């Protein structure tokens, strides 16, 4: 099984104030999101979803489609030791 970590870059400054930029109902526009956490430093926030495949190559094709559907646009990196594809925005 392979996995897709969809990630966004956060800037953060016990309440923790952060922000990231997200695409909007218009695809060529991005808007800074007011994100707070309650119990500048840069952080990466990810969520991971799944698939089974025969190939590291077939898994990418699938995950690429997933991301394209969801509107995730970023850099793609792969680590075969943990068989994890990552898409990072920002």
């Amino acid at each position, epitope marked *: 099984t392979f996995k897709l970590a969809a990630c966004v870059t956060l800037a953060c400054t016990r309440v923790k104030h952060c*922000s990231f*930029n997200i695409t909007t109902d218009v695809k*060529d*526009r*991005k*808007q*800074k*999101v*007011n994100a707070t956490f309650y119990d500048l430093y840069r952080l990466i926030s990810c969520q991971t979803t799944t698939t089974e495949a025969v190939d590291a190559a077939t898994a990418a094709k699938v995950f690429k489609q997933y991301a394209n559907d969801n509107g995730i646009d970023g850099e793609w990196t792969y680590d075969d030791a943990t068989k994890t594809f990552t898409v990072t925005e920002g």
Partner: antibody
Amino acid sequence: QRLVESGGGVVQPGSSLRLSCAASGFDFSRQGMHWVRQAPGQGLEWVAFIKYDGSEKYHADSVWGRLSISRDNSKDTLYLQMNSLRVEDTATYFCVREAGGPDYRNGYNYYDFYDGYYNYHYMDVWGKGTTVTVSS
Amino acid sequence: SALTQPASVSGSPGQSITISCQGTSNDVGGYESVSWYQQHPGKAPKVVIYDVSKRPSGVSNRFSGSKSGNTASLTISGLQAEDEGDYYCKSLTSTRRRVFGTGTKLTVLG
């Protein structure tokens, strides 16, 4: 885009006055705004700036905190609350728009929280000004 | 602390003049955010240069701007009668305040 100041007048030192500025012809709630003043025969002096959503404001040392900027976006109005007035506050007061828009990079237009404009660091619309004269 | 400008400059029509605007590393020297305003009697000022060297749409190509270290400059070439007026520089500062220069009266000797 038009800005129209009012509330100016002839007053005595120690008094208070509230200036208003009615904005029209642009989306007031997305743009930063300033007050700038000019005493008769003298130079421009920046008074204060307020962020589009009113979440942050800044004032010159010479006027903090006798003169305070605020805004009401539901009324497209900018205010300057002037307390403890001094003769040296005598000036024309201009309401002024901070030029602004998206930050364009990597093929994307980036906007601030709630779609607010980023600042372009120059002033692109001015009212005609309102006169304040402070004298004993 | 106001940015330092000469009190006055003057030139004949067709000549070039330059007005300086001296600040510190926390304003003029710290950002590419110097703008310049022309003001005629009884009117609001009007921007003629921003971001050091950029012209707003419609502003004559005779107006140009530059900066080196903590000093910015506005140059007006091919002086015309209508250039006469007062000129003010402005900069963003490190505390997000703004600050104007002391202003310069330009006379076009017509």
